[PDB]
Structure formats: structure tokens, C-alpha cells
Design a protein around this ligand. Structure first.
Ligand SMILES: [Cl-]
Ligand SMILES: [Cl-]
Lengths: 260, 260
């Protein structure tokens, strides 16, 4: 046994087709876990993640699922256990962002967001509980916008993550009967491909700045004067799913480099 | 003008067919508001509330809606404004309770809860924003279980209210452009008809006590050594929707008599 490591463990990571999820999947592999790379869209992209994990010396497989469809969540977890023999760790990075003043939010938009961010993650947790070995780990994704950061025209997404915060605290009570801990990570300002698409929403008069000015301003929000990156989130997930993270249970950790 | 009073104001209250909502509707009437008594089921019951409000000296009307159906929310608010001329105050008491270990929660149950408690209340807020006069008030219902009280096998309901907490903080930003404040009340231990139905869920080995033993134990949870009652919640809503409550905005007030 090596401390911090996940040798002999099997992990499943959702949302591995975006920046954070992909960094998480690779990092659990680097730590010694075999990894089920779950993803929603590009199979080519997901196989690149599998390939990285294999190059590091750990085994991996890509299994697709639409997390909006609960029957596909069931099949994903069944297939995970059938392929690797058991499952110890489940990490959800499944989510979509949304912006708009309350007055303009449609039924369709509310459902698009909640079906994945809140309902999807709830049922990922349910299937993880059902499938996990005793002493396992569940981590969901919240956001600094849930409690710690107030963005106008961001009510729908903020609420979708406030639900997750409450879920994890109570999930820890129920999942204790299998000695599984349940936590969430709540990232702030993480730079990925898609950050520059939406960075204007987060500051007054955002569209009057360049993408680079907006990235630099977000950097200054942390007193460390750098942006958050997918690896910053992966580093914390890695500790939570380790043996040494056990006594953190039922909690949401805001990961914004000290901004709040 | 009399301080604390709502003379000349018009209020709409949802869930007026249950204990808390009914006490709220009557109390806003007592404070001088004309009241739209919105309810989900028994028309006879709702007309009893109308009659009380009329006996106190204020006007009232019962308008039914299924708050799960967004088109019915639109019609409710249209009919409210058509009947009284304008609308100043909207209070949602719409919600259903649910219990069960995560492992057993169905798709159908998740949808039953979230459709009313979270989605329904979100769209009540949207329609209130659209219809309210400048300087108005919106109050939604959360729960002590959202953040302040952890009950095993209560994840679904707890999460449905965690969403509302986040909603109101951001709603206050958007609704500020009409000078409307937005808050939530988060009641604990409130005794009504239906409390005795579920009081066993809230204590270890709950079914081995009588209903009266369970009510007495809940009474002792507050350091004031009494139960919470619908009037306790009404008293606070009444202050929030008054002129004097204006500087409380974007907040969730836990109303549990000091239990947490
Ligand atoms: Cl993905
Ligand atoms: Cl009702």
C-alpha cells in the first residue's frame, strides 16, 4: 500500500468529454485506479482519454451514456462492474451551464438544466450506491455559484447546484450503511475551451472586454492571482476518493483558489 | 399609513389548502391586504379561507391552479390582476413531502417532488416578477432540512429545497430591476393535520413512540419548549412582505424556534 494511491481500485468518471471530467479520469488513472471513462458525445475524444490512462500504466475503457436517461445510468454501472469485476469510486462531472434573467426562463430551459445537473447526478449517486463495494466513494459536482458567488441572470444554474449541496449531506447518511462517503466539489473560475464562451456573463459589461482581459480579471479574483484549471479540481477529487480522505464526508468543498 | 400593515395592497398566496398557506392567507388579510386564495384541491376548504378573510374586513377570492403546470400559473396570475386591478405580493407555500433511502428512490418519485417544490415554485416566482407592481414582494418556501437539519432517508425533499435557497439569492438580483425583494422562509417542526402522519420519520425508532410522545419530543427540540405552528410562519411572512421588511432581501430565514 502507498498513501494517496488507488492501486487495485476501480473508478467510474462521468463527463470525461469536457475539460474537468477528462482531467479527473486521467488523474485517477495516474493514482493507480482502473478507469471507466464515461462520456456523453464524442467517442473519438473519450478514446483519447482512455489512451492517456493506458500510457500512464493503468487500464481504462470508454462507456457512453445519456445521463438524462436513468435506464442508461443503470446500464452504464452494470457494464462497468461486468468489465472490471467491481467498482469502488464514482465521480460525476455531468452538467450544463445556462444564463438568463428569471423573466425569460422557459419550461424547456429549466428542464434541459435540471434533467442533467440535478436529476442526472441524483441517479448517478443512486446507481453508485447500488453497485459500489463497501468502503467506496461518491463525488458529485456543485459550483461556487450555489452558495458562495452571486451572478445576476444565473438563477437556474445556481439552483440546480444548490440541490446537489443538500443531496450530498443527506446521501452521506444513507450511504453510510455501505461505509461509502459522499461529497461534492464546487469549482469556481476554471479555464477550459468553453470558459471563453461564457466569461462575459460573470462581470458587469462583460462584452466590452476582450477574452484575454476577461481571463486576466478572473485570474485576479483569487488572491493567488492565477486562474483555476481542471487539474486543481482533479487534485482535490483524488484526495477525497483516497483512504486518507475518509473523514471528509457529506461536505461540499468550494475550489476557487480563495476568491470567496 | 399604519406601520406593519398592508392596507391598499393585493396579495396572492399559493397552497392555501394546507395549514401554513391558510394561516398566511388569513394573516395577510388581517394586515389589510386583499387576497387571492390559491389552492390545489378542495374548493370548499379554500372558500372557508376566503370567508375568514372577509369576516376580518378584507376582500378575497379563491382561484384554483395546478402549480405543476406552468400554463396554469400564467392563468392564475392573469386572473389575479384582472380581478383586483394589480398585484403587490406573491407568497408560495406549494410543496409536498417525501421520504425514502436513496437506493429506493424512483424516477416517478423524484419527478413528483421536484415538479412542485422546485420547478413549480421557480415558475410562480417568474410569473410574480412579470405581473407585480414596482416595489412588490416575493416569498418562497424552503425548509430547515435544506441546510440546517439532516434527516436520514430525506435526500430528495432536502435537495428540492436547497435549490429554492439558491434561487432566491439570485432572484433578488434579477427582480431588483422592478424593486421587488425576494426571500424564502424555511420552517422547521410545524404542527398541522399532516404532521402526525410523518413525525415518526424524524427521530430514531420513531414508530415505537405514540403520536403525542413524538409531538412532545419535537416540542423539546426548540429551547423554547413548544411546537412551531402555522401562525409562527405567517408572522414572519407578514413582516417580510411589509414596507419595514425591505432590507431583508435575497435571504432564507430558518423558522424553527431556535432548534438548529
Ligand atoms: Cl462528456
Ligand atoms: Cl393547497
Amino acid at each position: 500500500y502507498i498513501p494517496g494511491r488507488l492501486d487495485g481500485k476501480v473508478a467510474l468518471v462521468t463527463g470525461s468529454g469536457r475539460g474537468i471530467g477528462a482531467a479527473v479520469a486521467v488523474h485517477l488513472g495516474r493514482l493507480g485506479a482502473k478507469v471507466v471513462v464515461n462520456y456523453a458525445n464524442s467517442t473519438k475524444d473519450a478514446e483519447k482519454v482512455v489512451s492517456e490512462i493506458k500510457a500512464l500504466g493503468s487500464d481504462a475503457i470508454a462507456i457512453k451514456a445519456d445521463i438524462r436517461q436513468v435506464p442508461e445510468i443503470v446500464k452504464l454501472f452494470d457494464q462497468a462492474v461486468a468489465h472490471f469485476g467491481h467498482l469502488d469510486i464514482a465521480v460525476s462531472n455531468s452538467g450544463v451551464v445556462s444564463f438568463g434573467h428569471l423573466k425569460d426562463v422557459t419550461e424547456e430551459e429549466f428542464d434541459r438544466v435540471f434533467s442533467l445537473n440535478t436529476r442526472g447526478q441524483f441517479f448517478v449517486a443512486r446507481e453508485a450506491y447500488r453497485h459500489l463495494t463497501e468502503g467506496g466513494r461518491i463525488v458529485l459536482t456543485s459550483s461556487n455559484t450555489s452558495k458562495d458567488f452571486s451572478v445576476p441572470k444565473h438563477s437556474l444554474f445556481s439552483g440546480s447546484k444548490g440541490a446537489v449541496d443538500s443531496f450530498v449531506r443527506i446521501f452521506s447518511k444513507d450511504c453510510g450503511d455501505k461505509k461509502i462517503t459522499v461529497n461534492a466539489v464546487a469549482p469556481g473560475g476554471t479555464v477550459t475551451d468553453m470558459f471563453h464562451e461564457v466569461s462575459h456573463h460573470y462581470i458587469p459589461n462583460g462584452t466590452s472586454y476582450t477574452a484575454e482581459q476577461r481571463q486576466q480579471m478572473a485570474a485576479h479574483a483569487s488572491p493567488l492571482h492565477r486562474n483555476g484549471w481542471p487539474q486543481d479540481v482533479a487534485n482535490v477529487v483524488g484526495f477525497l476518493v483516497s483512504k486518507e480522505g475518509e473523514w471528509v464526508n457529506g461536505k461540499v468543498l468550494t475550489l476557487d483558489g480563495g476568491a470567496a
